[PDB]
Design a protein around this motif. Structure first.
Motif, PDB file in Angstrom:
ATOM      1  N   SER A 170     117.206  98.551 -17.990  1.00  0.00           N
ATOM      2  CA  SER A 170     117.718  99.796 -17.431  1.00  0.00           C
ATOM      3  C   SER A 170     117.491 100.986 -18.356  1.00  0.00           C
ATOM      4  CB  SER A 170     119.205  99.649 -17.108  1.00  0.00           C
ATOM      5  OG  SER A 170     120.000  99.884 -18.256  1.00  0.00           O
ATOM      6  N   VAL A 196     118.638  94.485  -9.639  1.00  0.00           N
ATOM      7  CA  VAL A 196     117.758  95.501  -9.064  1.00  0.00           C
ATOM      8  C   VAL A 196     116.316  95.006  -9.041  1.00  0.00           C
ATOM      9  CG1 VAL A 196     116.651  97.671  -9.688  1.00  0.00           C
ATOM     10  CG2 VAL A 196     119.134  97.580  -9.375  1.00  0.00           C
ATOM     11  N   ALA A 198     124.894  95.935 -10.555  1.00  0.00           N
ATOM     12  CA  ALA A 198     123.897  97.001 -10.600  1.00  0.00           C
ATOM     13  C   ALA A 198     123.516  97.484  -9.205  1.00  0.00           C
ATOM     14  CB  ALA A 198     122.659  96.527 -11.360  1.00  0.00           C
ATOM     15  N   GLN A 230     124.171 101.354  -8.254  1.00  0.00           N
ATOM     16  CA  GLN A 230     123.095 102.262  -7.872  1.00  0.00           C
ATOM     17  C   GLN A 230     123.523 103.212  -6.760  1.00  0.00           C
ATOM     18  OE1 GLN A 230     120.089  99.588  -6.359  1.00  0.00           O
ATOM     19  NE2 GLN A 230     121.101  99.565  -4.355  1.00  0.00           N
ATOM     20  N   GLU A 231     124.582 102.871  -6.025  1.00  0.00           N
ATOM     21  CA  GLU A 231     125.143 103.725  -4.986  1.00  0.00           C
ATOM     22  C   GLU A 231     126.209 104.665  -5.535  1.00  0.00           C
ATOM     23  OE1 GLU A 231     124.277 104.335  -1.780  1.00  0.00           O
ATOM     24  OE2 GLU A 231     122.565 103.137  -2.461  1.00  0.00           O
TER      25      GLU A 231
END
Lengths: 149, 144
Positions: free
Chosen positions: B43, A125, B124, B128-129
């Motif tokens: 995270s 990310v 990740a 995230q979806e």
């Protein structure tokens, strides 16, 4: 199939070369035919040759100053000739502060003095903002590496 | 030191229970004090206790059919009582196809017959979806 003490020495030299943050000092531990794979497989990033790596890392380390390596976990399977490192990194870049975490799978060669294969999963990310800035950077300066990210 | 063969039996029972072939299932191989960590540390996800996992797994299982586990790499450090697994998973969900990849770090207990703690880094960008769809599903149906 290499001796465990030979593998463990390469493992430590690999970590020290990574922490030293020099291209020659880090690539000392990679075999002549070492490949790097970016995980997850769903990311679709092709295998990087040692030649790709020799072009990418000088760009990487020239843009990342005050590099710091935090080794969190080391898992060494000597009978298989494999090892895993979970590490955390930080540095300063012209694009701002850099923060990354890596799950690196390693394969040693038959002699055990080199790393023959690397598969690496990182902070995807955070890196989906940073790595494209690297590629835009390489293109803006016409540095024509033949390799991306 | 826990014998490599005892640790390997726990390693294989962990994988088989994850795939759904073992009797007594996935969680019979974990210590009573086992925790699960979501990597990366950036995270900011707090540790999941064994009680959190027993609540969470029926929700995933009910949303996931045709669960398939593909083992890509196993790295077993018997001297330290540690192991790493890279696996690929897939399933059908009401939200569409589910696809995940896992880098799981395992610590065995002193005897070597149980998993004492887990640290997992997954896909990740894909999660995230998927993960917020779970929270919306839980919230829409007034769960827990």
């Amino acid at each position: 199939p290499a001796p465990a003490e030979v593998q463990a020495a390469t493992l430590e030299k690999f970590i020290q070369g990574w922490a030293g943050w020099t291209p020659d000092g880090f690539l000392a531990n990679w075999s002549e035919d070492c490949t790097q794979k970016t995980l997850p497989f769903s990311s679709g990033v092709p295998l990087r040759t040692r030649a790709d790596t020799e072009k990418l890392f000088p760009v990487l380390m020239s843009l990342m100053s005050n590099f710091t390596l935090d080794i969190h976990n080391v898992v060494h399977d000597a009978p298989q000739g494999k090892a895993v490192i979970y590490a955390l990194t930080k540095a300063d870049t012209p694009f701002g502060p850099y923060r990354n975490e890596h799950a690196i799978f390693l394969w040693f060669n038959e002699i055990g003095d080199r790393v023959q294969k690397i598969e690496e999963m990182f902070d995807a990310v955070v890196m989906q903002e940073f790595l494209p800035k690297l590629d835009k950077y390489v293109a803006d300066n016409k540095m024509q590496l033949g390799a991306k990210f």
